[PDB]
Symmetry: D2
Subunit: 296 residues, 4 copies
């Protein structure tokens, strides 16, 4: 329990003010909001935190604030991944300094790197993490890095690796990974297939939509555990109706907008080049916020 | 049942040493599947090596399977070809032979517009003369990538009664189920059967059902009973087998296991498919024994 | 002589009932010859062979041979997914007196590279002496071959050429660099000029049916070191290709040919649909332009 | 005039992965000496994506001090972030670059409209310097249609397009639609064919060690000497074959190191070192190039 990384953890968003600068008050409220809905932990500084349109110092600032707000209360995973190994190492040392429970890193992107280079990249970050377990992060759709099962097996067995965030819709691979690593902490990465992901082998998940309805994902975990398939499907379907909308509106901004209507986020903007939410979607987003507040 | 829902084996086509149809083995395979308690057979699809068969050879298999199983279990005739006319001929034959439904893969190789795909299905449905159509979506092999909206349009065409979804995208699987509560939805990838059912599929069609269809039936039952553990254990056992078959070559691997099961006389596939690597025989034979002892 | 040159990928004319239109097929073969084409690639994608039966494909090979054997080079595309069916057509090509055979990498089902190699060997054997033209067209076949695999295929006993339907001109140059004597056909009409510069020494294409002389002109222009003419000719070809892609290439070509009094009924076989009527004016005008220019 | 053959500049680092200023200056001078028309700075080749904003600005400033007025200078200021890209654009303006450039923002999916506004914002910050749109789908993962490219190149303030695409049909279509557009061929290995299809120049990594060869191809084609153009392209490709095997940036730095231009041939991690089995060929290539011209 004190070291268990298994569970449902929200990929934290980064609230910005009207000038696109970090909105500290809103970030703090969002952390507390997540804690209150029973989330098992937070995954900070990942794609959802818009880490790739932030500087290193901005990412460290977010990590420090989240730790001050949640260290101890819930599990905290710091995504310290950058294309550069040196930058990733800096964030890793900061994560340990702030007291995070683990670090994570997306496979470095843009430039093509050999598998050996990817491996050494993880080794170097693990070294700088000084004891904090590493969560390998596989997300081919965004990184453009396509790993084979054998390569995934090598990565998750590297000394210091304690988990894999599997953002892949391939549930054959999900099952194969579980079969080869019975003890590996395996996070389902695509919210829209959470239930099927757990059935295939995942033992938890990390996702953007958990910020506004994490309790539903927890409900799916419970349902499957109790053999209540109908309830598991019902909850997954409700999550997917929401995901359908967010994909149309733009996921991060759609989520921030809902959080704004829930009195959590002051200004629902994402950083440029991300544009604002199209006015035509506001009625549905407001209705959703209203519904989630009633439900919860 | 008065519907097409269920676990249907994608029938293999046994050939002799000369690569000609082995009628005796074909009949044995049909009975073997029926004896296993399968709900039906999907005939003339990818698994039956239809794409390396002539139109007359595909029709011959449809006739024989009909003679062997008509009225005992459901029979779906995959009549799809790149050509609409050839597909129509097979549809007319499926009708004459008494099949319960027809099916057709999205025409491939040549790029066709969505409207052309729709007209293709409409034409085949016309020739099916009343038999419901099972749209067949298999992007990995066809090269045809349909959007959810296009799939929705296809499954709502007059005469369509089901969709064989050979896609590993379980978000789309759920979306399809959500938009079509009554649609017969077959999971196409054996290796994700359990997850596919959980996502919304209400049955499945697969190649490996030929040697262990009861396991898939067991997964259906396990989920219906809310026994997640048993569903996972069974899926895992199926995947261990699928891992092997992918290494050996799926069709020939299955035919080889069937050979050791005293069903298929000669486990060959048609060229360009090559033979099974001898180094795999020990494992395939052990699997055959394991499956037999399991029954 | 050899197989180098500009060969038109022959279309298969059909009547209103989608049956082979022999009269029009013969007219198209004679038409191409009159354009000064070096040869014909028969039974390939452009001939709508993948929506024809073995018997129908054989009939087309037999008829084209009767019409052009000895006048121009004839390459029979005998490729099918099935090796056996491919061999049957190979044997027929030999019987009818074609100059060479060709086969697209078998598609739909995934085959190991070894199975692809054995497939070509089997067909080469049935071709009974006729040289094999390997056909690489990943866009349509879904088969992605590495450079090493292509090198292996082109060096198989009996292989005398490669139809490279790929827009990767780096690979085109690499292939030429590794095989200085290989007959290498550029496959995408829209990059013909650049394809030749990269290493191709000829080409096979669908649009050669209505303007083969333009491609022959590009070959001449580059050979004379006249780059601007080569570019001008390529640009004109691409303006037409832009249109044919909008209308649908095969039916667009057949429609133009119809307006040229060559093809009676410009229909393709289903699932191919008819040409959108809104394109007729442009296609008819193009037909007018091409006849005058020639 | 931005038309021409311009080297995508590499960024030399020392043993501790820090900027090697002296080698950066030497490489700039080396390029000027081999007759390059200009330099493309801070792009993929400069390892900009494993550098911080301040580090990228430092390189822009040093290169400007070394070559402003001597050769054309294009600053690639592109980042995923619009704000960051704008900061670099303003710097490029301050340092006196002739133009700015920006790769289509990557990793996160962006709508075409967002891509357009991204460019507009950077163009605004460039305060006068023309924008060179940078299309490189293989690395960015952003696939643009011909129509979208036409829209981008017609944006106010856009004066060129670096086309890192092997699609020469599209290359011809772009030229046909834009007779006066400065169009740079981006893949060195198809340079000759790219020019024939419509490109009127190029920007490439290998220009750092054999830019004169590309200049020769331009000359050969302009003179109608197809044979020489092909010969030069073949020699370039033999080299590119090797570089792809060794790793392009590190292979180039190693050659430059053997030419005594670059002190330490390392790229920043995660890039690894060159496999020693390739040193004999790289040394031989450096020897050949030095004795060649
Ligand atoms: O929407 C994004 C993606 O479709 C993802 O859900 C799939 O790739 C699942 O296989
Ligand atoms: O092996 C075949 C395939 O990987 C299949 O399992 C996946 O496509 C599902 O995403
Ligand atoms: O238009 C069709 C294709 O894009 C073709 O020109 C390209 O594949 C060649 O690079
Ligand atoms: O090698 C790099 C790439 O393969 C490049 O040559 C191709 O994309 C060109 O079409």
């Amino acid at each position: 329990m004190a070291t268990n990384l298994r569970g449902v953890m929200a990929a934290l968003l980064t609230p910005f003010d009207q000038q696109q600068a970090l909105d500290k008050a809103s970030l703090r409220r969002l952390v507390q909001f997540n804690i209150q809905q029973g989330i098992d932990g937070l995954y900070v500084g990942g794609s959802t935190g818009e880490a790739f349109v932030q500087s290193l110092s901005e990412r460290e600032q977010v990590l420090e604030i989240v730790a001050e707000e949640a260290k101890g209360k819930i599990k905290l995973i710091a995504h310290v991944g950058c294309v550069s190994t040196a930058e990733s190492q800096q964030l890793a040392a900061s994560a340990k300094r702030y007291g995070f429970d683990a670090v994570s890193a997306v496979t470095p992107f843009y430039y093509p790197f050999s598998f050996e280079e990817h491996c050494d990249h993880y080794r170097a970050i693990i070294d700088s993490a000084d004891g904090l377990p590493m969560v390998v992060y596989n997300i081919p759709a965004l990184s453009g890095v396509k790993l084979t099962l054998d390569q995934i097996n090598t990565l998750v067995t590297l000394p210091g690796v304690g988990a894999l965030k599997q953002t892949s819709g391939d549930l054959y691979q999900m099952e194969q990974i579980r079969r080869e690593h019975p003890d590996l902490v395996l996070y389902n990465g695509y919210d829209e297939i959470f239930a099927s992901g757990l059935l295939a082998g995942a033992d938890g998940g990390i996702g953007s939509t958990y910020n506004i309805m994490g309790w539903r994902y927890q409900g799916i975990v419970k349902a499957l555990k109790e053999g209540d398939i109908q309830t598991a499907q019902k909850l997954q379907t409700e999550c997917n109706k929401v995901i359908d909308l967010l994909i149309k509106t733009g996921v991060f901004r759609g989520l921030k907008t809902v959080l704004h209507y829930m009195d959590v986020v002051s200004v629902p903007l994402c950083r440029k080049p991300f544009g604002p939410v199209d006015e035509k979607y506001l009625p549905e987003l407001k209705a959703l916020a209203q519904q989630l507040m009633q439900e919860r």
